[PDB]
């Protein structure tokens, strides 16, 4: 996968990111988007956990 490192949703705190809904990310973890072919976009300021969530979802897919 050539990921720089390995991370997962377990090490993620949704209290520090209350703006976005937690349930939607859990739904993404079901990998229903792979069938729909929908694209997942994370946008925010630096260091807010974008790459962390992206790599976590990638790990779930792997």
């Amino acid at each position: 996968s050539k990921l720089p490192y390995r991370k997962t949703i377990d090490t993620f705190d949704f209290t520090a990111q209350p703006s976005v809904d937690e349930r939607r990310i859990r739904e993404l973890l079901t990998l229903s988007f792979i069938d729909r072919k929908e694209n997942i976009l994370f946008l925010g300021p630096p260091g807010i956990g974008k790459t962390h969530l992206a790599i976590s979802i990638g790990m779930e897919a792997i």
Binding site: A16, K37, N39, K50, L53, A54
Partner: protein
């Protein structure tokens, strides 16, 4: 475009959708890229501050 309607793409970045024309140095090209990448997608906008520094600084108080 080749992955369009075939496989998901996971994108992560800190630049608004309007800055793509500047980043790629082409307005219509970026517009088409976004038109295809946003057709079937679920966009998450994260509003906050840098965890590593700001979160610890504001929660240690």
């Amino acid at each position: 475009a080749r992955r369009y309607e075939h496989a998901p793409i996971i994108l992560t970045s800190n630049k608004s959708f309007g800055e793509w024309g500047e980043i790629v140095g082409d307005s219509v090209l970026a517009t088409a890229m976004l038109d295809r990448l946003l057709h079937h997608s679920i966009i998450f906008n994260l509003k906050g501050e840098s965890y590593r520094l700001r979160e610890k600084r504001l929660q240690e108080e």
